[PDB]
């Protein structure tokens, strides 16, 4: 091994993009160059708000042996991990707009495995990208949730402040409890959300969604996080309760904006969401 | 009543001095309507939906200097910098040929500021800013109690230790405490109790300093309103004034202050004004895109 001496100064072009929740620094590794041994450190430097740009991390768009593009995600502490969802709509947008892909439907290689992306192009620009969020899981042990009762699905009452609420439990890889409200503005979000989050019956806590169904293809959405798996859980819950239909694109109005979700008759929940450019430029750095 | 929407963009440069960072916009080359500035500052400073910064700094034409600095915080309020961004403005102005000389002035909301850039290889490495004279009266801090002759020094009992602070204003209030090791200064503990003590009605920034020799010190600060910061320029000046008052350092000597974020070179000149020299660094440059509905 070696104790390095000297210093090196480089730069690369980047794009900051925002999809749902996170925002990352996107680097095209087809055109840019960062030494492998520098990646973790560069990810940390560039994600810092004070001495970097400021992001939840850095995502490299790279050559792949198995897909047109490959995604590598580094967190803001420099650790490389599974994206599990985050950044995919932005990678899909970037891939298509910079012609690393030739169709609207294409694949992306991620740590977890190869993923399908389908972009919506409106005026030569990608507005939305559609991704597979998997099947919901509706069993107590899968939520996870204590107690018995899962047939046809999990629905339980809950007394809070002299009023009988009813929530529907769904896992989309993470636990969700979905309550239907008449008016989403007077949802007990600050008050019922937190006390239900940490209730005994949820060993691993739970995300709490209050939703108002507008019609058979539209709903307003607020979540008390333990959020696209929340919007999916909320849609799956409305279909389970007979408020909405299977295999139809339902549009969810969040505080952020709109997600378009369909629980396919095939089984998967497919989620369509926006990706936007914040800025593009050249980042300069020095490693000593 | 406004309606419709505009999608726009501008070129910017993110720069920092000791890890306090801003988005810099050259308003000789860029256009942003006045009624959008607060909203743009807020939008662009947001780490999630924006770029990420402590705010936005416009470099503008001036009637009275080569350049004017306007500073907006990340909540969109326009305010006085108390020294923030002046070195990056000086670097930017010189490198983008908005000035002809290494010595020039910058118009600010707090008054016109002299700047002197150190150029090394066509680039500005350090900028030296006039921070003005210290103010040493209780009324100038501002502060309660009586006695400022020759200056303000109070004892303070906290947690069975006796401390002593010297009170100084560089446009903002400072209480300077001397310690033997800044790594074990009661920064997070004595910092906030003195910050909010009733004798400081507008609060105070609490500096802890280790004198290493007569031209050199280590520095930490509990900032009023914030807490523990990497880099407080006015505070570093306050600290150097405080040590000269207390006979620990000399007037007119250039003193290196080792802050957490880097070094600052400060002299309390015999004329009265305090001169502060430090780094300024580009992080990135680019185009920011935005929409206002």
CA-CA distance, A99 to B45, in Å (whole number)? 31
Strands A154-159 and A164-171: antiparallel
Considering only CB atoms, B52 lies closest to which of A22, A54, A283, namely: A54
Residue B164: beta bridge partners?
B155
The verdict on a CB contact (< 8 Å) between B283 and A283 is: yes
Go through the domains of chain B in sequence order and give each one's CATH number: 1-131+281-293 (3.10.310.10), 132-280 (3.10.310.10)
Using DSSP's 3-state secondary structure scheme, residue A40 falls into helix
Question: Which residue does chain B place closest to A46, by CA atoms?
Answer: B283
The response to whether B84 counts as a known ligand-binding position is: yes
Residue A207: partners with Cβ closer than 8 Å, 6 or more residues away: A174, A175, A176, A177, A197, A223, A224, A225, A226, A227, A229, A230, A233
User: Are A55 and B50 within 8 A, CB to CB?
Assistant: no
Out of B47, B230, B286, the one facing A54 most closely (by C-beta) is: B47
Q: How was this structure determined?
A: X-ray
Report the residue of chain A nearest B262, measured CA to CA: A51
Task: Kindly determine whether residue A54 and residue B49, on different chains, have CB atoms separated by under 8 Å.
Answer: no
A-B C-beta contacts closer than 8 Å: 60
> How many CA atoms within 13 Å lie on the side-chain side of A108?
36
What is the secondary structure of A15-27 as a DSSP string? EEEE-SS-EEEEE
Nearest to B96 by CA among B279, B233, B278, B285: B285
Question: Is B116 annotated among the ligand-binding residues?
Answer: no
A102 CB burial (10 A radius; 0-12, 13-18, 19+) = exposed
Instruction: Give the angle A262-A263-A265 at the CA atoms, nearest 5°.
Output: 120
Are the Cβ atoms of A51 and B282 closer than 8 angstroms? no
On whether B172 is known to bind a ligand per the annotation, the reply is yes
At residue B114's C-alpha, the angle toward residues B110 and B118, to 5°, is: 135
Contact B108, B149 (CB under 8 A): no
Report the residue from A22, A49, A280 with minimal CB separation from B52. A49
Of B60, B88, B232, B284, the catalytic one is B232
For this entry, resolution in Å reads 2.4
Bridge partners for B78 per DSSP: B72
Q: Which residue of A has its CA nearest to B48?
A: A23
Q: What is the C-alpha end-to-end distance of chain A, expressed in Å?
A: 17
Interface contact flag, B230 A50, Cβ < 8 Å: yes
DSSP state of A168: E
How deeply is B293 buried, as exposed, middle or buried, from its count of CB atoms within 10 A (0-12, 13-18, 19+)?
A: exposed
Reduced to 3 states (helix: H, G, I; strand: E, B; else coil), residue A104 is coil
How far is B97 from B119, CA to CA, in rounded Å? 13
Which runs of consecutive H residues, i.e. helices, occur in chain A?
39-47, 88-97, 192-197, 228-240
The CA distance from B202 to B192, in Å, is: 13
Neighbours of A68 (CB within 10 A): 17
Distant-in-sequence, close-in-space partners of A218: CB < 8 Å, separation ≥ 6: A250, A251, A253
CA distance B239 to B217: 9
Q: In 10 A of CB B103, how many CB atoms?
A: 11
Q: What are phi and psi of B139, to 5 degrees?
A: -55, -25
Contact B227, B197 (CB under 8 A): no
Cα B145 off chain centre by = 28
Is B232 catalytic? The answer is yes
């Amino acid at each position: 091994g070696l104790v390095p001496r000297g210093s090196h100064m480089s730069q690369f072009s980047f794009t900051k993009m925002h999809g749902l929740g996170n925002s990352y620094i996107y680097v095209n590794m087809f055109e840019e160059q960062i030494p492998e041994e520098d990646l973790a450190l560069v990810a940390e430097k560039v994600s810092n708000i004070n001495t970097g740009i400021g992001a939840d991390g850095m995502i490299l768009i790279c050559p792949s042996d198995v897909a047109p593009v490959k995604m590598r995600m580094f967190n803001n502490d420099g650790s490389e991990g599974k994206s599990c969802g985050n950044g995919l709509r932005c990678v899909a947008k970037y891939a298509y707009e910079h012609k690393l892909v030739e169709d609207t439907v294409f694949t992306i290689e991620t740590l977890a495995g190869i993923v399908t992306a389908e972009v919506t192009v409106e005026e030569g620009k990608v507005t939305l990208a559609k991704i597979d969020m998997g099947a919901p899981r509706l069993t107590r042990a899968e939520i996870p949730m204590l107690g018995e009762g899962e047939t046809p699905f999990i629905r339980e009452n809950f007394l809070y402040n002299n009023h009988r609420y009813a929530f529907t439990a769904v896992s989309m890889g993470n636990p969700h409890a979905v309550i239907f409200v008449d008016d989403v503005e007077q949802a007990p979000l600050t008050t019922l959300g937190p006390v239900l989050e940490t209730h005994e019956m949820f060993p691993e806590r739970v995300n709490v969604e209050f939703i108002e169904i507008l019609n058979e293809e539209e709903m307003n959405f607020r979540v008390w996080e333990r959020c696209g798996t929340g919007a999916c859980a909320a849609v799956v819950a409305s279909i389970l309760n007979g408020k909405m239909e299977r295999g139809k694109e339902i549009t969810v109005h969040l505080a952020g904006g709109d997600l378009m979700i369909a629980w396919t008759e095939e089984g998967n929940v497919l989620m369509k969401g926006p990706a936007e450019v914040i800025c593009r430029g050249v980042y300069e750095y020095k490693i000593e």
